[PDB]
Amino acid sequence: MITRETLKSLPANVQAPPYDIDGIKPGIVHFGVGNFFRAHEAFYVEQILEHAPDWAIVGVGLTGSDRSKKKAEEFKAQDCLYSLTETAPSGKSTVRVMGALRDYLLAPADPEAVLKHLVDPAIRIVSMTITEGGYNINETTGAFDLENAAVKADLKNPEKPSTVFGYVVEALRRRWDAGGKAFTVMSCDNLRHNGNVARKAFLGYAKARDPELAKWIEENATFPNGMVDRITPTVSAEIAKKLNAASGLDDDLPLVAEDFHQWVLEDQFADGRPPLEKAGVQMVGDVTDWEYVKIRMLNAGHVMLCFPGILVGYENVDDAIEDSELLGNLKNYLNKDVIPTLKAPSGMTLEGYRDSVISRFSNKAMSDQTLRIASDGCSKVQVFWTETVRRAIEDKRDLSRIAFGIASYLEMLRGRDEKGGTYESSEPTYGDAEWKLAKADDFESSLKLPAFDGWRDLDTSELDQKVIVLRKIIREKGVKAAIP
Protein backbone atom coordinates (compact mmCIF):
# COMPACT_ATOMS: atom_id res chain seq x y z
CA MET A 1 0.00 0.00 0.00
CA ILE A 2 1.10 3.57 -0.67
CA THR A 3 2.28 5.73 2.24
CA ARG A 4 -0.13 8.52 3.17
CA GLU A 5 -1.37 10.39 6.23
CA THR A 6 -4.78 8.71 5.96
CA LEU A 7 -3.49 5.35 4.74
CA LYS A 8 -1.76 4.69 8.05
CA SER A 9 -3.27 1.22 8.35
CA LEU A 10 0.15 -0.35 7.82
CA PRO A 11 0.71 -4.14 7.96
CA ALA A 12 1.15 -5.75 11.39
CA ASN A 13 4.93 -5.82 10.81
CA VAL A 14 5.20 -2.07 10.15
CA GLN A 15 5.24 0.30 13.12
CA ALA A 16 3.58 3.71 12.85
CA PRO A 17 4.54 6.99 14.52
CA PRO A 18 4.09 6.52 18.30
CA TYR A 19 2.12 9.77 18.69
CA ASP A 20 -0.78 11.73 17.24
CA ILE A 21 0.67 13.08 13.99
CA ASP A 22 -1.93 15.87 14.07
CA GLY A 23 -0.79 17.10 17.47
CA ILE A 24 2.88 17.79 16.76
CA LYS A 25 4.15 21.28 15.89
CA PRO A 26 7.45 22.47 14.27
CA GLY A 27 10.37 23.24 16.58
CA ILE A 28 13.32 22.46 14.32
CA VAL A 29 14.27 23.54 10.81
CA HIS A 30 16.70 21.18 9.07
CA PHE A 31 18.93 22.04 6.10
CA GLY A 32 19.89 19.13 3.85
CA VAL A 33 17.29 16.37 4.04
CA GLY A 34 19.49 13.38 3.26
CA ASN A 35 19.39 9.75 4.32
CA PHE A 36 21.55 10.18 7.41
CA PHE A 37 19.31 12.93 8.80
CA ARG A 38 16.21 10.84 8.17
CA ALA A 39 17.67 7.78 9.95
CA HIS A 40 19.49 9.57 12.76
CA GLU A 41 18.35 13.05 13.84
CA ALA A 42 14.77 12.46 12.67
CA PHE A 43 14.96 9.03 14.34
CA TYR A 44 15.75 10.39 17.81
CA VAL A 45 13.18 13.18 17.58
CA GLU A 46 10.56 10.62 16.56
CA GLN A 47 11.06 8.99 19.97
CA ILE A 48 10.48 12.11 22.08
CA LEU A 49 7.59 13.60 20.11
CA GLU A 50 5.16 11.69 22.34
CA HIS A 51 6.70 13.61 25.25
CA ALA A 52 7.22 17.04 23.72
CA PRO A 53 5.10 17.39 20.55
CA ASP A 54 6.48 20.85 19.75
CA TRP A 55 9.61 19.52 18.08
CA ALA A 56 8.39 18.54 14.63
CA ILE A 57 10.93 19.12 11.86
CA VAL A 58 10.59 21.39 8.82
CA GLY A 59 13.05 20.23 6.17
CA VAL A 60 14.74 22.53 3.67
CA GLY A 61 16.59 21.64 0.49
CA LEU A 62 19.14 24.18 -0.75
CA THR A 63 19.25 23.16 -4.43
CA GLY A 64 16.45 23.81 -6.90
CA SER A 65 17.60 21.41 -9.61
CA ASP A 66 15.07 19.44 -11.64
CA ARG A 67 15.87 16.46 -9.41
CA SER A 68 15.35 18.50 -6.24
CA LYS A 69 11.82 19.46 -7.24
CA LYS A 70 10.98 15.81 -7.94
CA LYS A 71 12.24 14.78 -4.50
CA ALA A 72 10.27 17.56 -2.81
CA GLU A 73 7.16 16.49 -4.73
CA GLU A 74 7.55 12.86 -3.71
CA PHE A 75 7.86 13.90 -0.05
CA LYS A 76 4.78 16.13 -0.12
CA ALA A 77 2.93 13.34 -1.94
CA GLN A 78 3.42 11.02 1.03
CA ASP A 79 2.68 13.76 3.57
CA CYS A 80 6.44 13.76 4.21
CA LEU A 81 6.09 10.27 5.70
CA TYR A 82 8.71 7.64 4.84
CA SER A 83 9.72 4.16 5.95
CA LEU A 84 12.88 3.32 7.82
CA THR A 85 14.07 -0.27 7.92
CA GLU A 86 16.57 -1.07 10.69
CA THR A 87 18.73 -4.16 10.14
CA ALA A 88 20.65 -5.91 12.93
CA PRO A 89 23.82 -8.03 12.51
CA SER A 90 21.63 -11.05 13.31
CA GLY A 91 20.01 -10.44 9.94
CA LYS A 92 16.67 -9.49 11.48
CA SER A 93 15.12 -6.19 10.38
CA THR A 94 12.20 -4.06 11.54
CA VAL A 95 10.39 -1.29 9.66
CA ARG A 96 8.55 1.85 10.75
CA VAL A 97 6.85 4.85 9.18
CA MET A 98 8.49 8.06 10.39
CA GLY A 99 6.38 11.15 11.05
CA ALA A 100 8.79 13.69 12.59
CA LEU A 101 9.39 15.52 9.27
CA ARG A 102 6.22 17.57 8.82
CA ASP A 103 7.17 19.72 5.83
CA TYR A 104 9.77 19.76 3.07
CA LEU A 105 10.58 23.09 1.45
CA LEU A 106 12.70 23.86 -1.58
CA ALA A 107 14.43 27.12 -0.63
CA PRO A 108 14.79 28.37 -4.22
CA ALA A 109 11.03 27.98 -4.81
CA ASP A 110 10.30 30.67 -2.19
CA PRO A 111 13.09 32.18 -0.06
CA GLU A 112 10.58 34.07 2.10
CA ALA A 113 8.82 30.80 2.99
CA VAL A 114 12.04 29.46 4.52
CA LEU A 115 12.71 32.70 6.38
CA LYS A 116 9.21 32.68 7.88
CA HIS A 117 9.91 29.32 9.51
CA LEU A 118 13.36 30.47 10.62
CA VAL A 119 12.00 33.54 12.43
CA ASP A 120 9.09 31.73 14.12
CA PRO A 121 9.56 31.78 17.93
CA ALA A 122 8.59 28.09 18.08
CA ILE A 123 11.63 27.22 15.96
CA ARG A 124 14.35 26.93 18.59
CA ILE A 125 16.86 24.74 16.76
CA VAL A 126 18.28 24.91 13.26
CA SER A 127 20.04 21.66 12.35
CA MET A 128 21.92 20.61 9.23
CA THR A 129 23.68 17.83 7.31
CA ILE A 130 25.34 19.54 4.34
CA THR A 131 28.64 17.61 4.25
CA GLU A 132 32.01 19.15 5.11
CA GLY A 133 32.30 20.96 1.80
CA GLY A 134 28.99 22.57 2.62
CA TYR A 135 30.54 24.72 5.36
CA ASN A 136 32.56 26.68 2.79
CA ILE A 137 35.84 26.57 4.72
CA ASN A 138 38.82 27.23 2.42
CA GLU A 139 41.14 24.21 2.59
CA THR A 140 44.25 26.39 2.39
CA THR A 141 43.44 29.38 4.61
CA GLY A 142 41.17 27.44 6.94
CA ALA A 143 38.77 30.38 7.00
CA PHE A 144 35.21 30.95 5.77
CA ASP A 145 35.63 31.72 2.06
CA LEU A 146 34.22 35.17 1.32
CA GLU A 147 35.17 34.71 -2.33
CA ASN A 148 32.59 32.00 -2.91
CA ALA A 149 30.14 33.09 -5.62
CA ALA A 150 26.92 32.28 -3.76
CA VAL A 151 28.26 33.85 -0.57
CA LYS A 152 29.14 37.13 -2.29
CA ALA A 153 25.72 37.22 -3.93
CA ASP A 154 24.07 36.70 -0.55
CA LEU A 155 26.20 39.51 0.84
CA LYS A 156 24.85 41.75 -1.95
CA ASN A 157 21.19 40.91 -1.26
CA PRO A 158 21.13 39.40 2.28
CA GLU A 159 17.36 39.88 2.51
CA LYS A 160 16.88 37.19 -0.15
CA PRO A 161 19.81 34.72 0.35
CA SER A 162 20.39 31.33 -1.27
CA THR A 163 23.09 29.86 0.99
CA VAL A 164 22.54 28.25 4.38
CA PHE A 165 24.83 30.93 5.80
CA GLY A 166 22.68 33.67 4.31
CA TYR A 167 19.40 32.14 5.49
CA VAL A 168 20.57 31.46 9.03
CA VAL A 169 22.30 34.78 9.63
CA GLU A 170 19.49 36.81 8.02
CA ALA A 171 16.97 34.88 10.14
CA LEU A 172 19.00 35.63 13.27
CA ARG A 173 19.21 39.31 12.34
CA ARG A 174 15.44 39.57 11.95
CA ARG A 175 14.80 37.70 15.20
CA TRP A 176 17.18 40.09 16.95
CA ASP A 177 15.72 43.26 15.42
CA ALA A 178 12.14 42.16 16.17
CA GLY A 179 12.96 41.39 19.79
CA GLY A 180 13.01 37.61 19.38
CA LYS A 181 15.56 35.10 20.67
CA ALA A 182 18.53 33.39 19.02
CA PHE A 183 18.19 29.72 18.15
CA THR A 184 20.64 26.84 18.46
CA VAL A 185 22.75 25.95 15.42
CA MET A 186 23.09 22.16 15.54
CA SER A 187 25.40 20.50 13.03
CA CYS A 188 24.77 16.78 12.56
CA ASP A 189 27.51 16.30 9.97
CA ASN A 190 30.21 13.74 10.82
CA LEU A 191 33.15 16.08 11.44
CA ARG A 192 35.45 16.52 14.42
CA HIS A 193 34.05 19.34 16.56
CA ASN A 194 31.28 19.95 14.03
CA GLY A 195 29.88 22.75 16.16
CA ASN A 196 33.13 24.68 16.01
CA VAL A 197 33.08 24.27 12.23
CA ALA A 198 29.52 25.60 12.05
CA ARG A 199 30.44 28.50 14.37
CA LYS A 200 33.35 29.49 12.11
CA ALA A 201 31.19 29.41 8.98
CA PHE A 202 28.12 31.21 10.34
CA LEU A 203 30.09 33.84 12.27
CA GLY A 204 32.42 34.21 9.30
CA TYR A 205 29.43 35.24 7.19
CA ALA A 206 27.88 37.28 9.99
CA LYS A 207 31.10 39.27 10.44
CA ALA A 208 31.19 40.17 6.75
CA ARG A 209 27.49 41.07 6.93
CA ASP A 210 27.80 43.28 10.02
CA PRO A 211 30.22 43.14 13.00
CA GLU A 212 27.49 44.10 15.48
CA LEU A 213 25.34 41.27 14.13
CA ALA A 214 28.14 38.72 14.52
CA LYS A 215 28.72 39.95 18.06
CA TRP A 216 25.05 39.35 18.90
CA ILE A 217 25.01 35.87 17.38
CA GLU A 218 28.27 34.92 19.09
CA GLU A 219 26.72 35.89 22.42
CA ASN A 220 23.18 34.56 22.06
CA ALA A 221 23.24 31.68 19.58
CA THR A 222 24.97 28.41 20.44
CA PHE A 223 26.91 25.91 18.30
CA PRO A 224 27.14 22.64 20.28
CA ASN A 225 29.48 19.94 19.04
CA GLY A 226 28.03 16.49 18.58
CA MET A 227 29.36 13.06 17.71
CA VAL A 228 27.09 11.09 15.39
CA ASP A 229 27.14 7.54 14.04
CA ARG A 230 24.79 5.10 12.22
CA ILE A 231 25.58 3.61 8.85
CA THR A 232 22.85 4.62 6.41
CA PRO A 233 23.89 3.50 2.86
CA THR A 234 22.89 5.13 -0.41
CA VAL A 235 19.50 3.94 -1.64
CA SER A 236 19.48 2.69 -5.24
CA ALA A 237 16.38 1.82 -7.26
CA GLU A 238 17.21 -1.84 -6.75
CA ILE A 239 17.64 -1.35 -3.01
CA ALA A 240 14.33 0.51 -2.74
CA LYS A 241 12.53 -2.38 -4.46
CA LYS A 242 13.93 -4.88 -1.95
CA LEU A 243 12.98 -2.71 1.01
CA ASN A 244 9.41 -2.18 -0.23
CA ALA A 245 9.00 -5.82 -1.25
CA ALA A 246 10.01 -6.75 2.30
CA SER A 247 7.91 -4.13 4.10
CA GLY A 248 4.89 -4.35 1.81
CA LEU A 249 4.76 -0.57 1.43
CA ASP A 250 4.81 1.36 -1.85
CA ASP A 251 7.33 3.86 -0.52
CA ASP A 252 8.92 6.33 -2.93
CA LEU A 253 11.54 7.30 -0.34
CA PRO A 254 12.47 4.11 1.56
CA LEU A 255 15.79 3.88 3.40
CA VAL A 256 17.62 1.43 5.63
CA ALA A 257 20.13 1.75 8.47
CA GLU A 258 21.97 -0.53 10.88
CA ASP A 259 20.19 -1.12 14.18
CA PHE A 260 23.14 0.50 15.99
CA HIS A 261 22.90 4.24 16.52
CA GLN A 262 24.62 6.81 18.70
CA TRP A 263 24.41 10.51 19.34
CA VAL A 264 26.62 12.34 21.81
CA LEU A 265 25.65 15.98 22.11
CA GLU A 266 27.06 18.93 24.05
CA ASP A 267 24.26 20.43 26.15
CA GLN A 268 24.59 24.01 24.92
CA PHE A 269 21.23 25.27 23.68
CA ALA A 270 20.20 28.90 23.24
CA ASP A 271 16.48 28.50 23.73
CA GLY A 272 15.54 25.02 24.92
CA ARG A 273 15.75 21.54 23.42
CA PRO A 274 13.78 18.28 23.20
CA PRO A 275 14.24 15.72 26.02
CA LEU A 276 16.64 13.76 23.80
CA GLU A 277 18.14 11.82 26.72
CA LYS A 278 14.83 9.93 26.83
CA ALA A 279 15.63 8.63 23.34
CA GLY A 280 19.16 7.56 24.22
CA VAL A 281 20.99 10.72 23.20
CA GLN A 282 24.01 11.12 25.47
CA MET A 283 24.24 14.68 26.73
CA VAL A 284 27.72 15.84 27.73
CA GLY A 285 29.73 18.92 28.62
CA ASP A 286 32.53 18.22 26.13
CA VAL A 287 32.32 15.90 23.10
CA THR A 288 36.10 15.43 22.84
CA ASP A 289 36.48 12.22 24.85
CA TRP A 290 33.70 10.47 22.91
CA GLU A 291 35.16 11.56 19.55
CA TYR A 292 38.43 9.86 20.47
CA VAL A 293 36.74 6.64 21.56
CA LYS A 294 35.19 6.45 18.08
CA ILE A 295 38.45 7.44 16.38
CA ARG A 296 40.75 5.15 18.35
CA MET A 297 38.50 2.09 18.63
CA LEU A 298 35.98 2.08 15.74
CA ASN A 299 38.02 3.82 13.02
CA ALA A 300 41.35 2.42 14.23
CA GLY A 301 39.78 -1.03 14.48
CA HIS A 302 38.37 -0.77 10.98
CA VAL A 303 41.83 -0.43 9.44
CA MET A 304 43.50 -2.89 11.83
CA LEU A 305 41.02 -5.37 10.38
CA CYS A 306 41.12 -4.34 6.73
CA PHE A 307 44.83 -3.85 6.10
CA PRO A 308 45.69 -7.49 6.86
CA GLY A 309 42.31 -8.62 5.51
CA ILE A 310 43.20 -7.28 2.05
CA LEU A 311 46.45 -9.28 2.16
CA VAL A 312 44.47 -12.44 2.99
CA GLY A 313 42.24 -11.65 0.03
CA TYR A 314 39.00 -10.58 1.67
CA GLU A 315 36.84 -8.27 -0.44
CA ASN A 316 34.40 -7.11 2.23
CA VAL A 317 34.61 -6.19 5.88
CA ASP A 318 32.08 -8.84 6.93
CA ASP A 319 34.23 -11.56 5.33
CA ALA A 320 37.31 -10.32 7.18
CA ILE A 321 35.62 -10.02 10.57
CA GLU A 322 34.60 -13.69 10.25
CA ASP A 323 38.24 -14.72 9.94
CA SER A 324 39.14 -16.25 13.33
CA GLU A 325 42.72 -14.95 13.31
CA LEU A 326 41.95 -11.42 12.08
CA LEU A 327 39.12 -11.18 14.62
CA GLY A 328 41.31 -12.35 17.48
CA ASN A 329 44.03 -9.88 16.49
CA LEU A 330 41.49 -7.03 16.40
CA LYS A 331 40.23 -7.92 19.88
CA ASN A 332 43.77 -8.18 21.23
CA TYR A 333 44.69 -4.77 19.78
CA LEU A 334 41.59 -3.15 21.29
CA ASN A 335 41.97 -4.93 24.67
CA LYS A 336 45.73 -4.67 25.12
CA ASP A 337 46.79 -1.53 23.24
CA VAL A 338 43.88 0.90 22.94
CA ILE A 339 41.59 0.41 25.95
CA PRO A 340 44.45 0.68 28.48
CA THR A 341 45.50 4.02 26.97
CA LEU A 342 42.05 5.47 26.22
CA LYS A 343 40.09 7.75 28.55
CA ALA A 344 36.60 6.39 29.17
CA PRO A 345 33.53 8.67 29.04
CA SER A 346 31.03 8.23 31.88
CA GLY A 347 27.98 6.00 31.54
CA MET A 348 29.61 3.41 29.26
CA THR A 349 32.36 0.80 29.21
CA LEU A 350 35.13 0.63 26.63
CA GLU A 351 34.61 -3.14 26.59
CA GLY A 352 30.97 -2.66 25.65
CA TYR A 353 32.07 -0.29 22.91
CA ARG A 354 34.56 -2.92 21.72
CA ASP A 355 31.72 -5.43 21.54
CA SER A 356 29.64 -3.07 19.40
CA VAL A 357 32.53 -2.43 17.01
CA ILE A 358 32.89 -6.17 16.43
CA SER A 359 29.14 -6.74 16.06
CA ARG A 360 28.71 -3.85 13.64
CA PHE A 361 31.52 -5.06 11.39
CA SER A 362 29.66 -8.39 11.22
CA ASN A 363 26.48 -6.73 9.85
CA LYS A 364 26.38 -8.25 6.36
CA ALA A 365 23.79 -5.76 5.08
CA MET A 366 26.16 -2.89 5.96
CA SER A 367 29.43 -4.50 4.89
CA ASP A 368 31.68 -2.23 2.87
CA GLN A 369 34.69 -3.17 0.75
CA THR A 370 38.03 -3.66 2.49
CA LEU A 371 39.85 -1.72 -0.23
CA ARG A 372 37.47 1.18 0.32
CA ILE A 373 38.22 1.21 4.04
CA ALA A 374 41.92 1.23 3.15
CA SER A 375 41.60 4.23 0.81
CA ASP A 376 43.65 7.22 2.00
CA GLY A 377 45.21 4.78 4.45
CA CYS A 378 47.93 7.33 5.18
CA SER A 379 45.53 9.93 6.58
CA LYS A 380 43.63 7.21 8.42
CA VAL A 381 46.77 5.86 10.07
CA GLN A 382 47.77 9.41 11.04
CA VAL A 383 44.39 10.19 12.60
CA PHE A 384 43.30 6.80 13.98
CA TRP A 385 46.57 5.23 15.17
CA THR A 386 48.96 8.00 16.29
CA GLU A 387 47.80 8.39 19.91
CA THR A 388 47.89 4.62 20.50
CA VAL A 389 51.42 4.38 19.10
CA ARG A 390 52.69 7.42 21.03
CA ARG A 391 51.33 6.02 24.31
CA ALA A 392 52.84 2.57 23.76
CA ILE A 393 56.25 4.12 23.06
CA GLU A 394 55.99 6.72 25.83
CA ASP A 395 54.84 4.25 28.50
CA LYS A 396 57.17 1.51 27.23
CA ARG A 397 54.39 -0.99 26.53
CA ASP A 398 54.36 -4.02 24.20
CA LEU A 399 54.67 -2.95 20.56
CA SER A 400 53.98 -6.34 18.95
CA ARG A 401 50.41 -5.73 17.73
CA ILE A 402 51.07 -2.08 16.95
CA ALA A 403 54.00 -3.14 14.76
CA PHE A 404 51.83 -5.79 13.11
CA GLY A 405 49.30 -3.17 12.06
CA ILE A 406 52.05 -1.04 10.53
CA ALA A 407 53.75 -3.99 8.82
CA SER A 408 50.38 -5.09 7.40
CA TYR A 409 49.68 -1.62 6.05
CA LEU A 410 53.12 -1.50 4.40
CA GLU A 411 52.76 -4.96 2.88
CA MET A 412 49.19 -4.20 1.74
CA LEU A 413 50.57 -1.22 -0.18
CA ARG A 414 52.52 -3.56 -2.49
CA GLY A 415 49.28 -4.48 -4.25
CA ARG A 416 48.99 -8.25 -4.07
CA ASP A 417 46.98 -10.61 -1.89
CA GLU A 418 47.92 -14.13 -0.83
CA LYS A 419 45.47 -15.64 -3.32
CA GLY A 420 47.25 -14.26 -6.37
CA GLY A 421 44.95 -11.34 -6.97
CA THR A 422 46.41 -7.91 -7.58
CA TYR A 423 44.91 -4.56 -6.64
CA GLU A 424 45.70 -0.87 -6.39
CA SER A 425 44.82 0.97 -3.20
CA SER A 426 44.10 4.69 -3.23
CA GLU A 427 46.39 7.15 -1.43
CA PRO A 428 45.56 10.70 -2.64
CA THR A 429 48.36 12.31 -0.60
CA TYR A 430 51.01 10.02 -2.09
CA GLY A 431 53.03 11.05 -5.12
CA ASP A 432 55.68 9.26 -7.20
CA ALA A 433 58.22 9.53 -4.39
CA GLU A 434 55.91 7.99 -1.79
CA TRP A 435 54.71 5.18 -4.07
CA LYS A 436 58.29 4.29 -5.00
CA LEU A 437 59.07 3.64 -1.34
CA ALA A 438 55.81 1.77 -0.78
CA LYS A 439 56.64 -0.60 -3.62
CA ALA A 440 60.35 -1.01 -2.87
CA ASP A 441 61.39 -4.65 -2.49
CA ASP A 442 63.30 -4.02 0.71
CA PHE A 443 61.63 -3.84 4.12
CA GLU A 444 62.92 -0.48 5.39
CA SER A 445 62.24 2.20 2.79
CA SER A 446 58.49 2.56 3.31
CA LEU A 447 59.01 3.26 7.01
CA LYS A 448 59.66 6.81 5.80
CA LEU A 449 56.11 7.19 4.40
CA PRO A 450 54.17 10.19 5.84
CA ALA A 451 51.68 7.80 7.46
CA PHE A 452 53.96 7.39 10.48
CA ASP A 453 54.99 11.04 10.98
CA GLY A 454 52.69 11.49 13.99
CA TRP A 455 55.09 9.63 16.27
CA ARG A 456 58.38 10.11 14.44
CA ASP A 457 59.63 12.60 17.06
CA LEU A 458 59.81 9.78 19.62
CA ASP A 459 62.40 7.00 19.69
CA THR A 460 60.88 4.65 17.12
CA SER A 461 63.95 2.37 17.08
CA GLU A 462 62.35 -0.66 18.73
CA LEU A 463 59.05 -0.22 16.88
CA ASP A 464 60.68 0.11 13.46
CA GLN A 465 62.88 -2.96 13.99
CA LYS A 466 59.86 -5.04 15.01
CA VAL A 467 57.97 -3.76 11.97
CA ILE A 468 60.81 -4.90 9.71
CA VAL A 469 60.85 -8.34 11.35
CA LEU A 470 57.09 -8.72 10.80
CA ARG A 471 57.11 -7.47 7.20
CA LYS A 472 59.69 -10.16 6.52
CA ILE A 473 57.48 -12.86 8.04
CA ILE A 474 54.40 -11.56 6.20
CA ARG A 475 56.13 -11.66 2.84
CA GLU A 476 57.57 -15.14 3.28
CA LYS A 477 54.95 -16.99 5.34
CA GLY A 478 51.82 -14.86 4.82
CA VAL A 479 50.12 -12.30 7.06
CA LYS A 480 48.56 -14.69 9.59
CA ALA A 481 52.01 -16.08 10.37
CA ALA A 482 53.01 -12.61 11.63
CA ILE A 483 50.09 -12.14 14.05
CA PRO A 484 51.35 -11.71 17.67
Residue numbers in the entry: 1 to 484
What is written in the article reporting this PDB entry?
The identified GoSLDH had 32–82% sequence identity with polyol-specific long-chain dehydrogenase family enzymes. Further, the catalytic region of Pseudomonas fluorescens MDH (PfMDH) was identified as the previously suggested conserved sequence (KXXXXNXXH) of polyol-specific long-chain dehydrogenase. This GoSLDH alignment (Q9KWR5) revealed the presence of three highly conserved residues, Lys294, Asn299, and His302, that have been found in other known polyol-specific long-chain dehydrogenases. In addition, GoSLDH possessed the active site residues of Asp190, Val228, Lys294, and Asp299. The structure of GoSLDH and PfMDH bound with D-sorbitol lacked sufficient detail to reveal precisely how it bound. To understand the binding conformation of D-sorbitol along with GoSLDH and PfMDH, molecular docking was performed. D-Sorbitol formed strong interactions of five hydrogen bonds with GoSLDH, with Asn190, Lys294, and Leu191 playing the roles of interacting amino acids. In addition to the hydrogen bonding network, the amino acids Met227, Val287, Ile295, and Phe384 showed hydrophobic bonding with the D-sorbitol in GoSLDH. The distance between Lys294 and the O2 hydrogen atom of D-sorbitol was 2.35 Å, which favors close contact. Given the shorter distance between Lys294 and the O2 hydrogen of the substrate, it seems that GoSLDH could abstract a proton more efficiently than PfMDH. Further, the high activity of GoSLDH was analyzed in a structural analysis together with CV and ITC studies. These observations suggested that recombinant GoSLDH is more catalytically efficient than other SLDH or MDH due to the close proximity of D-sorbitol to the catalytic residue, along with high binding affinity.
In this study, we heterologously expressed and fully characterized a recombinant polyol-specific long-chain GoSLDH. Based on the conserved catalytic motif (KXXXXHXXH) in polyol-specific long-chain dehydrogenase, GoSLDH can be grouped into the subfamily of polyol-specific long-chain dehydrogenases. The observed results suggested that GoSLDH is highly specific towards D-sorbitol, mannitol, and D-arabinitol. Measurement of activity with D-sorbitol as a substrate suggested that GoSLDH is exclusively an NADP+-dependent enzyme, resulting in only 2.5% relative activity with NAD+.
